[PDB]
Every structure is written in structure tokens, then in C-alpha cells.
Design an enzyme around this catalytic site. Structure first.
Site, PDB file in Angstrom:
ATOM      1  CD  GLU A 117      -2.472  -8.472  24.696  1.00 57.45           C
ATOM      2  OE1 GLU A 117      -2.253  -9.111  25.747  1.00 57.45           O
ATOM      3  OE2 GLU A 117      -1.821  -7.465  24.347  1.00 57.45           O
ATOM      4  CG  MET A 259      -4.188 -12.480  28.877  1.00 53.34           C
ATOM      5  SD  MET A 259      -3.368 -11.237  27.848  1.00 53.34           S
ATOM      6  CE  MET A 259      -4.480  -9.829  28.071  1.00 53.34           C
ATOM      7  CD  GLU A 294       1.305 -11.311  32.380  1.00 55.10           C
ATOM      8  OE1 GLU A 294       0.551 -10.422  31.918  1.00 55.10           O
ATOM      9  OE2 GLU A 294       2.239 -11.805  31.712  1.00 55.10           O
TER      10      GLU A 294
HETATM   11 ZN   LIG Z   1       2.865  -7.673  29.076  1.00 53.25          ZN
END
Ligand SMILES: [Zn+2]
Length: 866
Positions: A117, A259, A294
Site C-alpha cells: 500500500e 498493514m 488492522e
Molecule cells: Zn488503517
């Protein structure tokens, strides 16, 4: 670098439905084979335009035919003359060991890991690297067995084998179509903590936490938090995990926090590793919130993703809101709300007043990595919270349910989410949508009148958002404005008009509006913008006595803290102006008395008392001023601390002693008492020197946990106590081998009030525990100096700016994302005096002229110099 615009969104000419990846892994040379099943949706003559960065192309086949109709261009592979449906096969090479930017496939210590990302997957292979292209991934990983005994990707293991020459392979399949930003790969040798969670409906989920060898002693809290998150999402949102395994890998080298890669989260070790001697209460609670965050993305981000990157807040606002709700439900709601408001007022408002100002849904982006912001995240959450305020929990959950019903398995937009909320609830959010498109902080001005003839109380409320560099036009917003009215006894006055109750959340939708309340039997003391009901600046002409009344009587703990903040604001402003005129602190007796009462109040929650006794930070104080005087602010903060330390010395020591705890527990009641004890210690450190020195050194030495040790160490640095150098050295000698623990010490060095702080910081670039190769170290030493020591960063000789230029000259080439984080204090130049502005402008112009200036820095520098 060219800007990209939200209004330019167009559906892709081609979709990819399935991708089979093979990685022949090696730190120096990794070979990627990617077999994609593609479908043309666009015009039959449209070429397939694949994104790619720093790839060595080996071959291109279409249905196994070597392809001749292609060309490489800047950032792209353009393939012409294709069938409507076909198999694309790309082979390319990449070099993880050369990847210092930490985006794509890279090296973290001895491990190989990914960060995809926002647009990292194009650094791995040529692909449709845009989040509205969802594909089913299978991933085969081939590697040296000794170096990389664990080979992980998203989903489930479907195949494995051994090869000659000491290699082995594992193949993974993830049944859920996903955008490539959610792809992850990890290879390495790890200790693994294994546990299970059984969902409400009986799905058994294997939980696996991968940590560096030797770190198993620091894993159980993260595992516990994962299970806590899973349970809470079931209870609160009715959401269950949807796969068979949940993996988390803790890595030391990572640009963000963590992430949400589907079924294979990758975390900065800072948000995983904890033991009572290495981690503070704050670390424990941060691990809880990031683990939760997350996990919550599994639905709000993964099962429903983003159509394009301008919609980032669709997942981030909502997931931040979710992490806040999780933390608030499990812990102290008041303390969480207070802390999140401090972040909004002290950090996010600064951003909204800066050259980088943007709506929570940006309209224009050059480098998308620059938009992982306080605005998109924290203001994003405030906007979600306003929807919650307008709808209430029941309707809000109906909106969540409709959102998933409509959009599960797809990439959606901010507007889709609002529509779902509006449709489920029957609450009109058409005006409310402006919060997505308008940047800057609204200023809400309130005037009141009490009419004793009619027993009516009138609030005249006005709003305006000052223009921002990105937006010359501003319009009124739909502002949920929560109020409470208190009589002389501190009892709540029922809100009503014309014989009907009136909702306490007022809909402030116009530039100016009048609200009238009847049967107001006594002149009220109002509590305004309750629980910070809208992300706005409040202007109301409080008396000191109204504020101290609220500190005493307000029903919500947040209102009591907020009243204290308004009281302090007046005297912070007073004393900064005094500092500028060379005059010492002045504080009315009745103000000190309000804080004495907080200390001696037996009924008050220690959690609330601790926060009231925690002075606004230098960043929070800065936002009280049009033009920031960072030296005056820092010196006033110290002077205020010293004055309260002196006036409240006996009460502070009494409360410090009373909150002693011999057992250390990561439990909310214990945390509250400890936070209060340490809040008292802060002031006590600024008392009579010998007394303070003994108290602080004793706590450092007797501490049975890092929270208390760090509180003492921080106090020694803050008050420049005799024991400081000895304690700092002891900590270094004990902990130098532990980077996460040393981060706390680098922060203390960087934020020191000592005259020689910059010299010390420069020297620490050579410290055994410091390295420019590690984002955490960089942020803890350099980041903390520039961002959290504005008094030193803004030294009148300009030495702070010159230091930052030196650091950014390195980081621009090494790791542009971390460079861009660190340039932020420099782009705030217009908030400073003319002499400072000119030095900061000079610094920015030097950076503007760098050879190979990153797009990351270019975007910020150009905005700042405009
Ligand atoms: Zn986030």
C-alpha cells in the site's frame, strides 16, 4: 511529477480476475513470474497499460505466445493489439537488498517482506496497480530452506515441495478477490506464537504471530489483543473473521505502523512487542489499538475496499473510528476521547492550517504516500463519529449492515458509504457530505442570552471556515453541536420548546442560526460541543467561574477536562504575551485553586484527574496562536508547571504517595492510578531541587515496570535534575541492544530542554543504537527533535533548520516516505515570525534544488514555497 485528480476517475479498460505468482526468492536477485487472466472491458482498440517501477523485464507472453506489440515507457508497460480475454505472462527481476525505500519487496534484517500500500505492488511486477482491480491470488514462493524456512503469503497453504540445492517451496491461495495493495509475502526464520480463536458461529481460526528469534517473551500481549479485537468486532459490529488462519509478522524495518494485508498482517515491531520491563502502559494500549485497527480493516478495507486512492478515508476514517470504539469500550472512554481530541486540536488542526491542507477525500494528489494523514485518519474518524452522533448506534449499525450488503466483494467510494448510512437511517446526509469535500477547520462562534421575563435561553450560533491554500471557496457545514444546560445546583435543565423536548444535538447548518429553549427556570451554565461533537474551534466568552463550575459539575468526564482546557487556554495566552514582554508568569489564585480541588476530590475518577493534571503539549499550545512563538510557548509551559508545583506541593506529594501500587498490572483501574501518580511526579520534579532529585531517582531505581521507570527518567530530563546524566547513562548501558527501548531514550534526548540539545542530537547520529537505515530510529531522534522540540528546532540562529536539511538530503535518496514525514515541521513556515520564515524558506529552497528530488518532497516543498 504530475498531479492526479479525483474528477478524472475512469473505470479500467482491462480487468484482471486471477493472478498466479511465482517468486524465486533471493536478496540480490528475485525472479517474479506473474500469470494473469485478463478481460477487456474498454474499447476493442485500447492498449493494456501496466504500472511498473524499477523492474528488469525478462519476457512478455500472451497465451504463451512471445509478444512483439509492446513498449516500455516511464513507469509503464503498454501492450497493444490484444484479444478480449487472454492470459498475460510477465517475467521480471527485482532486487530486495537494494530497496532502501521499503516499498515493494525488501529486506528487514535477515527477513524478506513486502509493503504494497498504496502503490508498492508495481515495484514487484508489471500490474494494474489500482484498487478497483480485484483478483484472486495464488502465490508460489521458492527459496533457500536454511535462510528462509518460513515462506508466507495471503490465505491458505495449498502446496509445498522440496528442491535440489537446499531449496524448498510453498504455494498459497487466498479465495477472496483483492486489490494488489493487500498482497503480502514474508520469508525468514522466526519464532512463532500459536493460538486459536473460535468465532461466535464456531469457525476455528488458527492465530500465528511471527517474531524474530528470541522475541517470544514479548508476543503474548499482541496475541491477547488480537483475540480481544476478534471478540469485540463480533459483539459490537456483528462481524466475524472469514478465513482459517490469521498471521501477523513483526518486522523491525517498516515505514508505517502496520498493514492489513488479507490474512497476513505485517506490523512494525513497535506495535507488537511488549513485556513489563520494556513497554509502558501507553505501548500496551497502542499495541491494543493497532492490532485492533488492522483486524478491523478485514471488513472495513478488505471485504469492502476503495475504488481509488482519493477514497482512502472510506477505509481509514471508518477503521480509526472502529479502533477508537474498541479502545473506548475495553478501557476508559473518557481518557480515549480526551486523547483523541488532543490529537485533533494539537496536530490535525495544525495540518488543516498548513500548505498541505486537504479534505478527508482529497481532490488532487501528486504522491499518494503523502496522504496517509492526520486529516484522512483522525479527522476522517471525527466525520464517521458525526454520522454516529446524528444517527445513533442502532441506525449507525443498520447503515453498516446496508453498506456491507451492497458493497461486500467490491471497491467502493466515500459517497457509497454515506448513501448507505442515509438510506438505512432515513437521516438526510446531503448537506453532511460537504465534510468530505471541504478542507480547513470550521470556527463555531456562540453567543447566549437569558431572558428572565420569559424564562427563555437563546443561543446564537455562527460558523465559518477560513479559506485554505487549496480552496478559495468555503461553505457552511452540517455541524452536530451537542449542548447541556446546568442550573445553580449543577442539575441538568431539560431542553424543550413550545411544550416539546428538543434534542441536545443541535443541527448547526447555516452561517448564522438562533436556538431558543423555553422553561429555563434559572440562568444556565452551558456545556458546549459536548464530547467534541464536531471537529471545530469553539469561540464562546467563558467566565473563569463558568469553567470551574463545569470542572465541578459537568456530567460527562470529557466536559470536565475540556472546561479545564478552556480555563488554561486563557492563561497560556496571557503568559505567552507576557514572556514576549520579558515578564514572569501571572496566574490568578482561583485558577490554582481549581487544580487543587481536582487533586483533593475523592469522588473524581483517577483517570480523569490524571488528564486534567496533564498540561496541554507545546503542539496543543501552538494552536492557540495565529503566529507561533515556540520559545515563549516552551518557557511558559515550564513556568506554569513550576508555579503549580510550588502552589500544590503538599497535595501533589499526598496524591503521588496515595496512588502507589506494589503490583504491576496492565488493567485499566491500575493504569489510571499510575497515570495520576506520574502526572503528580511531573510537577514534583519541578519542586525544590534536592527533594525532586531524591523522589525522581528513587522512582527510576525502584520501578518494577517501564512505565514508572520512563516517567522518572523523563522528569529528570524535563527538570534538568542532578541525577539526569547518571540515569540516562544507566538506561543506555542496560538497554542499548534493544532498539524499541532505545527509541524512548532518543525521544528524551531530542526533546530535552538543555541548551546544548542540538549538539547532543548531532552526536547521537553516531550512537551505537542509532542507524539511518531504520525508520523507527530516525523518527525517535531526528523526527522528535524537529516535530516535538519546536523551541530547539526553531532556535533563532536557524541551526535547527540546517540540521533538518542535512538529514533530509540523505533521506530524500534513501527513504523518501520517511523524508516526507520529517519535512512537515519546515512547511509550517507561515505560522512563524518573518525572520524565521526567511530561514525556513531558505532551507526549503535548498531542498527544492536537490539532484533527484523525490516526488514525495517535491509535492510538500512546492506547496510550502507557494
Ligand atoms: Zn488503517
Amino acid at each position: 511529477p504530475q498531479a492526479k485528480y479525483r474528477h478524472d476517475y475512469r473505470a479500467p479498460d482491462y480487468q484482471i480476475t486471477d493472478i498466479d505468482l511465482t517468486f524465486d526468492l533471493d536478496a540480490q536477485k528475485t525472479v517474479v513470474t506473474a500469470v494473469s487472466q485478463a478481460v477487456r472491458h474498454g474499447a476493442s482498440d485500447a492498449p493494456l497499460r501496466l504500472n511498473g517501477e524499477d523492474l528488469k523485464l525478462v519476457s512478455v507472453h500472451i497465451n504463451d505466445e512471445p509478444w512483439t506489440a509492446w513498449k516500455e515507457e516511464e513507469g509503464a508497460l503498454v501492450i497493444s493489439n490484444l484479444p478480449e480475454r487472454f492470459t498475460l505472462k510477465i517475467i521480471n527481476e527485482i532486487s530486495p537488498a537494494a530497496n532502501t525505500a521499503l516499498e515493494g519487496l525488501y529486506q528487514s534484517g535477515d527477513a524478506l517482506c513486502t509493503q504494497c500500500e498504496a502503490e508498492g505492488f508495481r515495484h514487484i511486477t508489471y500490474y494494474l496497480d489500482r484498487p478497483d482491480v480485484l483478483a484472486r491470488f495464488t502465490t508460489k514462493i521458492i527459496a533457500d530452506k536454511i535462510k528462509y524456512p518460513f515462506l508466507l503469503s495471503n490465505g491458505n497453504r495449498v502446496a509445498q515441495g522440496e528442491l535440489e540445492n537446499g531449496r524448498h517451496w510453498v504455494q498459497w491461495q487466498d479465495p477472496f478477490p483483492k486489490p494488489c495493495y493487500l498482497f503480502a509475502l514474508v520469508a525468514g526464520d522466526f519464532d512463532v506464537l500459536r493460538d486459536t480463536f473460535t468465532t461466535r458461529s464456531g469457525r476455528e481460526v488458527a492465530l500465528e504471530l511471527y517474531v524474530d528469534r528470541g522475541n517470544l517473551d514479548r508476543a503474548p500481549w499482541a496475541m491477547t489483543s488480537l483475540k480481544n479485537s476478534m471478540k469485540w468486532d463480533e459483539e459490537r459490529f456483528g462481524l466475524e473473521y472469514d478465513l482459517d488462519i490469521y498471521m501477523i509478522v513483526a518486522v523491525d524495518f517498516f515505514n508505517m505502523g502496520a498493514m492489513e494485508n488479507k490474512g497476513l498482517n505485517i506490523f512494525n515491531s513497535k506495535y507488537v512487542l511488549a513485556r513489563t520491563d520494556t513497554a509502558t502502559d501507553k505501548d500496551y494500549l497502542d499495541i491494543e489499538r493497532v492490532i485492533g485497527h488492522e483486524y478491523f480493516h478485514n471488513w472495513t478495507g478488505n471485504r469492502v475496499t476503495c475504488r481509488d486512492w482519493f477514497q482512502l478515508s472510506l477505509k481509514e476514517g471508518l477503521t480509526v473510528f472502529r479502533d477508537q470504539e474498541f479502545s473506548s469500550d475495553l478501557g476508559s472512554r473518557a481518557v480515549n476521547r480526551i486523547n483523541n481530541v488532543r490529537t485533533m486540536r494539537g496536530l490535525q488542526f495544525a495540518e488543516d492550517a498548513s500548505p498541505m491542507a486537504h479534505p478527508i477525500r482529497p481532490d488532487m494528489v501528486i504522491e499518494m504516500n503523502n496522504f496517509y494523514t492526520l486529516t484522512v485518519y483522525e479527522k476522517g474518524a471525527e466525520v464517521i463519529r458525526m454520522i454516529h452522533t446524528l444517527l445513533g448506534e442502532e441506525n449507525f449499525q443498520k447503515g453498516m449492515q446496508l453498506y456491507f450488503e451492497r458493497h461486500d466483494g467490491s471497491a467502493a467510494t466515500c459517497d457509497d458509504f454515506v448513501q448507505a448510512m442515509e438510506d438505512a437511517s432515513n437521516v438526510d446526509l446531503s448537506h453532511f457530505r460537504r465534510w468530505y469535500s471541504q478542507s480547513g477547520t470550521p470556527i463555531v462562534t456562540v453567543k447566549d442570552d437569558y431572558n428572565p421575563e420569559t424564562e427563555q435561553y437563546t443561543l446564537t450560533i455562527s460558523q465559518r471556515t477560513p479559506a485554505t491554500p487549496d480552496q478559495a471557496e468555503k461553505q457552511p457545514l452540517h455541524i452536530p453541536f451537542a449542548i447541556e444546560l446546568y442550573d445553580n445546583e449543577g442539575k441538568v435543565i431539560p431542553l424543550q420548546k413550545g411544550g416539546h423536548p428538543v434534542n441536545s444535538v443541535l443541527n448547526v447548518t447555516q452561517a448564522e442560526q438562533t436556538f431558543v429553549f423555553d422553561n429555563v427556570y434559572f440562568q444556565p451554565v452551558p456545556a458546549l460541543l459536548c464530547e467534541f461533537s464536531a471537529p471545530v474551534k469553539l469561540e464562546y466568552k467563558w467566565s473563569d467561574q463558568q469553567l470551574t463550575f463545569l470542572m465541578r459539575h459537568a456530567r460527562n468526564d470529557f466536559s470536565r477536562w475540556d472546561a479545564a482546557q478552556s480555563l488554561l487556554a486563557t492563561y497560556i495566552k496571557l503568559n505567552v504575551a507576557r514572556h514576549q514582554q520579558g515578564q514572569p508568569l501571572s496566574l490568578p489564585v482561583h485558577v490554582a485553586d481549581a487544580f487543587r480541588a481536582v487533586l483533593l476530590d475523592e469522588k473524581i475518577d483517577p483517570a480523569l484527574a490524571a488528564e486534567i493534571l496533564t498540561l496541554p503539549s507545546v503542539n496543543e499550545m501552538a494552536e492557540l496562536f495565529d503566529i507561533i512563538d515556540p520559545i515563549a510557548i516552551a518557557e511558559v509551559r515550564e513556568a506554569l508547571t513550576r508555579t503549580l508545583a510550588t502552589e500544590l506541593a503538599d497535595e501533589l506529594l499526598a496524591i503521588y504517595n496515595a496512588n502507589y501500587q506494589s503490583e504491576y498490572r496492565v488493567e485499566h483501574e491500575d493504569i489510571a492510578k499510575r497515570t495520576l501518580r506520574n502526572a503528580c511526579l511531573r510537577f514534583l520534579a519541578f519542586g525544590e531541587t534536592h527533594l525532586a532529585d531524591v523522589l525522581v531517582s528513587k522512582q527510576f531505581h525502584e520501578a518494577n515496570n517501564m512505565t514508572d521507570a520512563l516517567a522518572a527518567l523523563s522528569a529528570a530530563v524535563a527538570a534538568q535534575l542532578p541525577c539526569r546524566d547518571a540515569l540516562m547513562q544507566e538506561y543506555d548501558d542496560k538497554w542499548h541492544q534493544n532498539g524499541l527501548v532505545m527509541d524512548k531514550w532518543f525521544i528524551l534526548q531530542a526533546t530535552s530542554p538543555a541548551a546544548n540539545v542540538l549538539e547532543t542530537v548531532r552526536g547521537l547520529l553516531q550512537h551505537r543504537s542509532f542507524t539511518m537505515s531504520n525508520p523507527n530510529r530516525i523518527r525517535s531522534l531526528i523526527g522528535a527533535f524537529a516535530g516535538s522540540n519546536p523551541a530547539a528546532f526553531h532556535a533563532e540562529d536557524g541551526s535547527g533548520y540546517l540540521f533538518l536539511v542535512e538529514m533530509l538530503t540523505d533521506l530524500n535518496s534513501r527513504n523518501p516516505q520517511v523524508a516526507s514525514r520529517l519535512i512537515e515541521p519546515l512547511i509550517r513556515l507561515k505560522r512563524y515570525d518573518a525572520k524565521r520564515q526567511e530561514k525556513m524558506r531558505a532551507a526549503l529552497e535548498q531542498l527544492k534544488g536537490l539532484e533527484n528530488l523525490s516526488g514525495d518532497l517535491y509535492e510538500k516543498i512546492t506547496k510550502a514555497l507557494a
